[PDB]
Amino acid sequence: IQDAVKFIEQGHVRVGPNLINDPAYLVTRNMEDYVTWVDNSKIKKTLLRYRNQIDDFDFS
Amino acid sequence: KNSKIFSPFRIIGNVSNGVPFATGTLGSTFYIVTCVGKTFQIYDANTLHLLFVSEKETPSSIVALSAHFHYVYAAYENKVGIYKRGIEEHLLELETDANVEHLCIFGDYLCASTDDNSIFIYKKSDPQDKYPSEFYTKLTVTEIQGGEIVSLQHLATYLNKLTVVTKSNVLLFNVRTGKLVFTSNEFPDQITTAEPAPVLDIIALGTVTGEVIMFNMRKGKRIRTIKIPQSRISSLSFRTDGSSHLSVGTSSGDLIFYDLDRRSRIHVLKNIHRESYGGVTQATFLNGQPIIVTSGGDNSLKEYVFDPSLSQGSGDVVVQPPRYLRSRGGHSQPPSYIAFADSQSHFMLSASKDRSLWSFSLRKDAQSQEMSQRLHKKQDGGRVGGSTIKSKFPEIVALAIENARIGEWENIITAHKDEKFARTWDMRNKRVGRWTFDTTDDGFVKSVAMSQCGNFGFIGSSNGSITIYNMQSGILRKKYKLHKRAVTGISLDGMNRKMVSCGLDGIVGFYDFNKSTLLGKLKLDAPITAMVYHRSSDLFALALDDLSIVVIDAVTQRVVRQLWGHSNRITAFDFSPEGRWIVSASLDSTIRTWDLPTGGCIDGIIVDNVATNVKFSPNGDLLATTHVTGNGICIWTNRAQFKTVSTRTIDESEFLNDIDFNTYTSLEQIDKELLTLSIGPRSKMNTLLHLDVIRKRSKPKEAPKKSEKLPFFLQLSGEKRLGFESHFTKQLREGSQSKDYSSLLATLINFSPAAVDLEIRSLNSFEPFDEIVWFIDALTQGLKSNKNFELYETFMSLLFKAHGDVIHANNKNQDIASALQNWEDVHKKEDRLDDLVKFCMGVAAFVTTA
Amino acid sequence: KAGPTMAMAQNPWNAVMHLGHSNGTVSLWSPSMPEPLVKLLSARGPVNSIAIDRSGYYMATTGADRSMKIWDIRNFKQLHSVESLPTPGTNVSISDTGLLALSRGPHVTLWKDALKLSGDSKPCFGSMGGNPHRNTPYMSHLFAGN
Amino acid sequence: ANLVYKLDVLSSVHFVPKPASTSLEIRVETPTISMEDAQPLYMSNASSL
Amino acid sequence: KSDFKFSNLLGTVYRQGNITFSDDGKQLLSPVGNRVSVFDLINNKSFTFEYEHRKNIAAIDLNKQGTLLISIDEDGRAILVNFKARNVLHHFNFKEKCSAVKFSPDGRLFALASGRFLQIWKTPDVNKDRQFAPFVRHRVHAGHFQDITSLTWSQDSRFILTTSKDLSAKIWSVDSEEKNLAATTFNGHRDYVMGAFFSHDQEKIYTVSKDGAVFVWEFTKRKYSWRITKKHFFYANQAKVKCVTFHPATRLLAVGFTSGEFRLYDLPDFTLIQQLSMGQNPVNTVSVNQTGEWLAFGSSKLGQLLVYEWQSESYILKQQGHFDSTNSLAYSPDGSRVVTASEDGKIKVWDITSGFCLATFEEHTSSVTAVQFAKRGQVMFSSSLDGTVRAWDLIRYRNFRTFTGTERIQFNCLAVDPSGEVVCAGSLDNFDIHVWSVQTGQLLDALSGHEGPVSCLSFSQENSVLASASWDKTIRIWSIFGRSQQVEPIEVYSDVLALSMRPDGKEVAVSTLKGQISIFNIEDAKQVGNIDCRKDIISGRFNQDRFTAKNSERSKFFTTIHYSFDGMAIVAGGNNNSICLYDVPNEVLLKRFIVSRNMALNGTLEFLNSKKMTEAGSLDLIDDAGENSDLEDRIDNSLPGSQRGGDLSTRKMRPEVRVTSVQFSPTANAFAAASTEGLLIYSTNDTILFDPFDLDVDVTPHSTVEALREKQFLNALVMAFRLNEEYLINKVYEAIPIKEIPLVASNIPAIYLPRILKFIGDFAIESQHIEFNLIWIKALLSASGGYINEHKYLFSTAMRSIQRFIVRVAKEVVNTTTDNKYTYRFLVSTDGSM
RNA sequence: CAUUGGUGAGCAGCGAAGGAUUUGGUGGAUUACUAGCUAAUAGCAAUCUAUUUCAAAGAAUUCAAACUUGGGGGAAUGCCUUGUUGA
């Protein structure tokens, strides 16, 4: 629960189109479905490299 | 040499020139006051920020500088000047034709020494005067008393005594009485400098042979003779903290520190200033603090600190080496090329003949930097070439910058003299980039360019090969080749479509860039030297070799403007930001501002120094130029941003206003048979129709509270039948007498809408209906004049709103019906605009929707 | 009920609270009653700072009316009032051995023996002709720009 | 009312609204020139009704 | 085509600082949070200065000759403005915070209340050139104990009085010899004195304080000097005075209380003339006219400005901008009205020419999120988060229907058919494109088939099909008319949002989340061109950020696209600090615009300063609300998750800069972008640019006037378009006779037809020649109307401007011609009386 | 055979009296430069004291203020408010 705060503050986490940097954001029950990692980021590259799934045309 | 377009601002990029500067204590802080040529600057000590410059430049060079607590004393050709805050507060004139060389100030007695061995004494008239103004006396040093006056000093705790040092001896002058009181023994060497000391009655003398002779002026005997091997001594100062440190500054760029307690050396700083420009001209300690400020002819000003000792207990023996601190500087040479780094008119890139490249700032003069020539490591893993003993790059002759994509890769391409590759520079990192672009046909580069997108850079060889490189990998995309001589200019339009080039064969070659086809050729007569493209107006100009400027439209293949008149080679030129003007600097020391509509020069400035380059700012405020001599960059303010410009040919005179000022005022009416509106706001007709509804909306929702004990005539308390009729009513009565109402209708237009509704609803015509008839006949003449037709229609709309019941009650009367029918016979030819409007938007609806 | 409190001081002898208000009346306080104990109208305008001696016998008060007064708390009488000092005293404090400190804001001024009942020992900035009766400042220190 | 405001401004005011409503209104036959803020200009001239 | 520049900041009429009038009553200068806005309340024309300050404007004062304007930042960054030249003269940096600026009525020298000092400087001459050091200080007066908060010159030019944060207020003589005449110190106020004023005579001084006390100082006996004659009290129990002003000739005080009330007083009697109220906002700024009958009143926290004549109990303008909240934009078909959305639910029809709202629409409780126009601008639609999409009139100012969903889901965007029949809207929550009829308020169906929210929608103006931008990375084409009911997907690289479509109706412009902007063809579903966009975007590093601006993935995309009506250009705007204007077939940008320069906003800078990070915490992120002297701004009600909330006191940060809806103007070659700073309008209407077309050596401005002498009319006019200078075109256009108009207009070549129609539409809007210009419009449209029909999209910006000209200014003249004629026919031919 | 794994031995090529990493300290920018201090229309800066005191001015919420309370239930002793003895 603390390493999430580290990743949010470093600028990795988006809610739809835009990333939010303030970790004190209440996410709506509807809006809970859409929280992914931001694109072109090193927090996403490690996740896809373990799965052997990196499609770097989308520079992920 | 006066101008009607440009006016000088300042000289950006100068710090010092080589004159021995002065410093003045000011409370706790210090200010370092230097001079640059015909002006002078004031630098703070703790930050080296520029504080004040001279508001008005001196007529000649500043020879001597001295500064008291507040008042800086500058000494140019004949006169000395007392300045505060940069403002010329007082000008003190020397009543002699000789030139002032040294300027000492102590007490109420200013001490000005001319070059022909005469010392002028200036006295404060009042003992509480802030500067000396009256002329006391004229001391004279003959040829039997000594040589020329090397310096004027005033030693501490001497009552009205002036210490004069010649080339052979030291003299004293009781300036209250003007009498010599003591002469020193002859010094066999030529004394070059003088300085007082924190010890009493002690002056330090430095000779041309490296001897520091330390003359006790009370006993008249020297004390310490410090020997320096064969070095010309220029500067002398003492560290007044309490530790015994003597700073002697050679003209060979060396700074030697002596510990007078232990009779030993401390440190010999090497090459703090260049040899050829004078070396260490003036170097002094700040009074009581271990910060020494040095300056020379190399256009730089450095600060060095003596750090506290590493040993906790020993102290005085193990003294720290001097250590570099704050420094401001410029080029040691005059600057060759100048460009602009951004559209905000903030940064100016200047490459000089001092083998360097600086990024000056027009906004803050302490923001300047020397852009680093430290090469990046090669991507291959192979070691790069060049000397191990590092030297600077060769002199840069052509430059190009694109500000579109900055900081993500290299955005400057600079072209050096006699080098077969151009070099990349990153403006944001302020560092030479990691790519060099070879011509690949064995050729020096004579012109470079950028695309406006910033991805593509164009390189022009000396053998015609226009190679096109890329910015990311430095890889070579295309190699165009059309010429046989050296390519002397490349550009590209905004669209990345039309690529233009020009060489010494007179060929202007138009290329397409999306495909790889030659669009066309344009052969001229003379060879083409330089070319500046204006991307907004799609016009590029060429500086030809028949001493003319030819402007060619980039799309329509042909010469569109041709300008003649320069008596020598057009050195450099640049377009106006709006494309209206071309400025051009030529070798006959003239600068001409051609106007591209009229095809003629509108301002000719005979600048005294030959201008190598001119360059407009992308913002329309600044004209930047560089001269043949002078290390700085002269900046001219564009006076077109304030005052309108008369486009008049003026070149033959030095060496209707509607068309001249390029503003055409509209006519009041084209012809009498037109139907033109009134001069003013178009919503004046809207307020006259609906005056009641607008105020009723604009009233507040509730009634505001009032203290009902107010004075009744508080509006008339502004703190500062025939005779009582209004000025309109008298004019309406006079209008019926003279049968003319054009005097009446002039006041009817200019009245306020609230005044008009007061005027129309109160016409004082109820029983005889006379002023109704006069006002109707006034508006028959108004519609017959056909001006202000929108207003005159709304005036009887307000008449029929107010007295519509009045004229309906007395309808069919033969006088009122005659006036109204005479208005309809005028109004019968006012359906022409109705037929015009009902036609025009029916076509406009049908054409646009089909 | 006297606006915002603008000054704090503890009496070491008595543990009563002293309160400088915007009305210019310093008010003694104690948690035994919800009423103020005494109310001394010291200076006009507001009261900037107050300080009480270790003896619990003397207090100094100052405010933005360019005034500074010395009070004896036991009889609620001012021993001597100093008026027309150049800048208003932002801070006052009394040492253990009766050395009164006054902070004009860029300056720090100290008066020795400016507390006792005699009218000669009224603190002052000078003495005409070396008159020994006036209380010259014990030590003044100038700060740079603070 | 102020709890709903304090909930939505805490919720990054993307917010699920009320289900439905059906109310009654009245409309005074004012000139449409006087159904706006104070201004030297307008665009309508006919009645509100 | 690409020489755009800033010309008007529509909206945000007043933000903070010192509102002022001109020396005449014409111009009203209001401090907007970046720059000075110059409105004119007599000749209804607005103007916003093109220069940008670095932070918020603290104080503004104009010279009494109307020539020099000084605008001073809150950190003391003074900027001179040559007011008639509308350019910058100098950039001074006063070292402290300045609070009040006032020139002398002579105008030779001005006084500055910065810090605890009063600085008196001599104003530079306007006609002198731009020198390096134009400012020379007369004196500095330091006789005060706290910050100076107000400044007031004399009716003469020799006495300056200042009231400070300390309880005193002092009169300082600007002449050295008159120091003995005016050196006394007025004090005795119980609280913050924030205004003193000389009377109509030099004798009396009335000082106004925060506690409600007005002191009248008179030079008399119990020699004798400056007693108090009488004190007056406002008796506002919890309302405190915020600022005051006093015109001495009409002896009027106008006080501003923080509750919202303002009162008008006559000073030798102290009688309350009028007391009105705005609302709950503090009256932050009060100023008076030079003639003393116009009062400019302004509040900050709602951003409203109110100019009110004190004599007649009636306003002149009550306008109210809204900071940070303009979610969307919609132009009118005529390029004179721009409406906008708000977070308050307000839909406000602003006017281009004067920067004030015409009408307001507050019937949405929730925030309005998308605003569009339909069917010649008479009807208009708006989507909100309230669960409804509401139609509106612009003739009766009322809703027709309030369309809703089956369960009141939220809404993101709105689109309308060009015929007023179908409305549609998209949602974050339900992500089905609901459609309604305009006539029947029931919804027809739910066009579904998407995974994730439909972001943007738009109907085609010719084919009448709709395109849906969705977070499914798919562009969906729905042919919903005439038995088709077919669905065509065009899938793209990444999360596509902010669709736009050409006025030709055969292309789709979209903005992917990856940064790139793709352009398709609707009928032929292949991709016909993409433009990369990631490099030319300024993603500002926020002060709360913990990453560089390079890899800041926050705002390196575009969330707004609109085509040009010519079909030749695309303006892309986004969450970033940049507005870009791309060219469609040439793949490359034209020029890039920086929307704002404000560290009051968050993302104005890629490079933050290194003297702001201490060893812990950024210096500007330190909550400094406690150092304030008041109570209401000390109160912090900041919720933790108030990212784009309902207020600004709940934010706890500074607002971020973004542009969110950009549309081209349909008439006058401009485009308006709804920004954080308000509603920026960039325009090219100044036309100071040498744009040629097929020039030659012989053709000159001398050849233009000479061709008018020998009456070669078509040779003069066509070769005037060769230079394309506006005064050169205006010279030949107003000089040719009426009978030679149709012969000239019939033989004008096809190249110069878009130039003449752009000139006539631009010039005739403000020109007195209705009859001459409409003769030219008749002759041009009846001799070359076939070509304009054959190329509609080349002329559609100019052809809309011409029919704007006949409707907006030329039709109501015909209306008054008909109305006067008909009421004359009635009054002279019908019944008598009795 | 691939290794898109690490560790080591070399070569081709790059290659001007060395070159790679890695790191401490300091200086200059990171918004557009009108100088220090004070009691300031002036003085100091080597100080304001044996010149800085008197005079003049200066008192309304007539005896005013938590706009700053997590929620539920109370409140004995407290505190607040309104009625009940004596100067």
Swiss-Prot record, chain A:
Gene Ontology CC annotations of this record: 90S preribosome; Mpp10 complex; nucleolus; nucleoplasm; small-subunit processome
GO molecular function, one term: RNA folding chaperone
Keyword Iron-sulfur: no
Localization annotation: Nucleus, Nucleolus
Source superkingdom: Eukaryota
Keyword annotations of the record: Nucleus, Ribonucleoprotein, Ribosome biogenesis, RNA-binding, rRNA processing, rRNA-binding
A GO biological-process term: ribosomal small subunit biogenesis
Domain (S4 RNA-binding) ranges: 1-52
Keyword rRNA processing: yes
Quaternary structure, from the entry: Component of a heterotrimeric complex containing IMP3, IMP4 and MPP10. Interacts with MPP10. Component of the ribosomal small subunit (SSU) processome composed of at least 40 protein subunits and snoRNA U3.
Biological role stated in the UniProt entry: Required for the early cleavages at sites A0, A1 and A2 during 18S ribosomal pre-RNA processing.
Protein family membership: Belongs to the universal ribosomal protein uS4 family.
Entry protein name: U3 small nucleolar ribonucleoprotein protein IMP3
Organism listed in the record: Saccharomyces cerevisiae (strain ATCC 204508 / S288c)
Gene: IMP3
Portion of the parent chain present: 124 to 183 of 183
Swiss-Prot record, chain B:
Subcellular location, principal: nucleus
Gene3D superfamilies from the UniProt entry: YVTN repeat-like/Quinoprotein amine dehydrogenase
Any single GO CC term annotated in Swiss-Prot or TrEMBL for this entry: small-subunit processome
WD repeats: 22-53, 63-93, 101-140, 150-183, 190-227, 234-269, 277-329, 336-370, 397-436, 445-479, 487-523, 528-563, 565-606, 608-646
Signal sequence annotation: none
Cellular localisation: Nucleus, Nucleolus
CDD domains: WD40
A Pfam family the protein falls into: Utp21
Keywords: Acetylation, Nucleus, Phosphoprotein, Repeat, Ribonucleoprotein, Ribosome biogenesis, rRNA processing, WD repeat
GO biological process, alphabetically ordered: maturation of SSU-rRNA; rRNA processing
InterPro entries named among the record's database cross-references: Quinoprotein_ADH-like_sf, SSU_processome_Utp21, WD40/YVTN_repeat-like_dom_sf, WD40_repeat_CS, WD40_repeat_dom_sf, WD40_rpt
PANTHER family per UniProt: WD REPEAT-CONTAINING PROTEIN 36 (PTHR22840:SF12)
Function text: Involved in nucleolar processing of pre-18S ribosomal RNA and ribosome assembly.
Known partners and oligomeric status: Interacts with snoRNA U3. Interacts with MPP10. Interacts (via WD repeats) with UTP18. Component of the ribosomal small subunit (SSU) processome composed of at least 40 protein subunits and snoRNA U3.
Domain comment as written in the entry: The WD repeats are grouped into two tandem seven-bladed beta-propeller regions.
Note: Present with 2020 molecules/cell in log phase SD medium.
Name of the featured protein: U3 small nucleolar RNA-associated protein 21
From Swiss-Prot, chain C:
Residue stretches of each WD repeat: 1-39, 42-81, 84-121
Superkingdom classification of source: Eukaryota
Subcellular location: Nucleus, Nucleolus
Note: Present with 5800 molecules/cell in log phase SD medium.
Quaternary structure note: Interacts with snoRNA U3. Interacts with MPP10. Component of the ribosomal small subunit (SSU) processome composed of at least 40 protein subunits and snoRNA U3.
Biological function: Involved in nucleolar processing of pre-18S ribosomal RNA.
Name of the protein: U3 small nucleolar RNA-associated protein 7
Species the sequence originates in: Saccharomyces cerevisiae (strain ATCC 204508 / S288c) (Baker's yeast)
Higher taxonomy: Eukaryota, Fungi, Dikarya, Ascomycota, Saccharomycotina
From Swiss-Prot, chain D:
Localization, UniProt: Nucleus, Nucleolus
Top-rank lineage group of the source organism: Eukaryota
Record text on subunit structure and interactions: Component of a heterotrimeric complex containing IMP3, IMP4 and MPP10. Interacts with snoRNA U3. Component of the ribosomal small subunit (SSU) processome composed of at least 40 protein subunits and snoRNA U3. Interacts with the SSU processome subunits EMG1, IMP3, IMP4, KRR1, NOC4/UTP19, NOP1, RPS4A, RPS4B, RPS6A, RPS6B, RPS7A, RPS7B, RPS9A, RPS9B, RPS14A, RPS14B, UTP1-UTP18, UTP20-UTP22 and UTP25.
Function per UniProt: Involved in nucleolar processing of pre-18S ribosomal RNA. Required for the early cleavages at sites A0, A1 and A2 during 18S ribosomal pre-RNA processing.
Family membership: Belongs to the MPP10 family.
The name this protein goes by in its record: U3 small nucleolar RNA-associated protein MPP10
Taxonomic source organism: Saccharomyces cerevisiae (strain ATCC 204508 / S288c)
Source organism phylogeny: Eukaryota, Fungi, Dikarya, Ascomycota, Saccharomycotina
Name of the coding gene: MPP10
Portion of the full-length sequence here: 442 to 490 of 593
